[PDB]
Design a protein around this ligand. Structure first.
Ligand SMILES: [Mn+2]
Ligand SMILES: [Mn+2]
Lengths: 126, 127
């Protein structure tokens, strides 16, 4: 029986730029040979994430990891993501009680989401 | 916040094939339209996973989601995966006290891992 999530691993080109992304946006906590595949582990809210050198290097897709946030800090988060100059999907016009998410990319084509409110998939607003 | 993981959403060609992958292998529990993109949610050991029908494929990389299993279940899961017929990166020879992982794909070029033992990334073993 599956006992829990063990980790997620992502391949990026540049571990320092991805480190900056994970620390600035998610307050990722970094835990820790001449390798060509250098790597790093972080914890973000109970999740172990490995970043390892490789190729950014795919296509963009709608696959994504969503992290939960409070509704009250959606605007703050949006401003930090905007500070990294990464690609964001502009938030659309919204009605009251419509739960908010932010969709945006890292430097290697991965799509992330910060999700507040009721669990659901919101990509179809874009 | 970051309170925790909200969910992971995977895009797949055929929701029925993927349902069988997730259910036969991970014992995923299905949760709760006329869209030409429907969706399902499943729960796997507390992770909320959504799958959503889309495009056709995506090339293969080493980005992967790894779930935790126990060392005494590795061979059994290995069987459950081969029985489904999915592509699997076969276990290499191994020494005593090294933990085992199984790396295998779904039907849509997503890499998954069942990881027993000590946390580390094990991709280098397949080089
Ligand atoms: Mn989502
Ligand atoms: Mn791994």
């Amino acid at each position: 029986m599956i006992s829990g999530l063990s980790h997620i691993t992502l391949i990026v080109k540049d571990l320092n730029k991805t480190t900056a992304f994970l620390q600035n946006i998610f307050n990722a906590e970094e835990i820790y040979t001449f390798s060509l595949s250098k790597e790093k582990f972080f914890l973000i809210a109970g999740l172990w994430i490995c970043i390892m050198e490789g190729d950014s290097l795919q296509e963009r897709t709608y696959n994504h990891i969503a992290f939960q946030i409070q509704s009250e800090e959606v605007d703050e988060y949006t401003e930090r993501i905007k500070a990294l100059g990464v690609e964001m999907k502009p938030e659309r016009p919204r009605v009251q009680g419509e739960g908010r998410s932010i969709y945006f990319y890292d430097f290697d084509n991965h799509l992330f989401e910060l999700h507040a409110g009721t669990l659901e998939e919101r990509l179809k607003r874009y």
